[PDB]
């Protein structure tokens, strides 16, 4: 949801 991009490198 949020984690799959936040704990990768987006927002």
Curated annotation (Swiss-Prot):
Cellular localisation: Cell projection, Cilium, Photoreceptor outer segment; Membrane; Photoreceptor inner segment
Tissues where the protein occurs: Rod.
Region annotated Interaction with RHO, chain positions: 1-11
Assembly behavior: Heterotrimeric G proteins are composed of 3 subunits alpha, beta and gamma. The alpha chain contains the guanine nucleotide binding site. Interacts with RHO. Interacts with RGS9 and PDE6G. Interacts (when myristoylated) with UNC119; interaction is required for localization in sensory neurons.
Function: Functions as a signal transducer for the rod photoreceptor RHO. Required for normal RHO-mediated light perception by the retina. Guanine nucleotide-binding proteins (G proteins) function as transducers downstream of G protein-coupled receptors (GPCRs), such as the photoreceptor RHO. The alpha chain contains the guanine nucleotide binding site and alternates between an active, GTP-bound state and an inactive, GDP-bound state. Activated RHO promotes GDP release and GTP binding. Signaling is mediated via downstream effector proteins, such as cGMP-phosphodiesterase.
Annotated protein name in UniProt: Guanine nucleotide-binding protein G(t) subunit alpha-1
Full-protein positions shown: 340 to 350 of 350
């Amino acid at each position: 949801i949020k984690e799959n991009l936040k704990d990768c490198g987006l927002f």
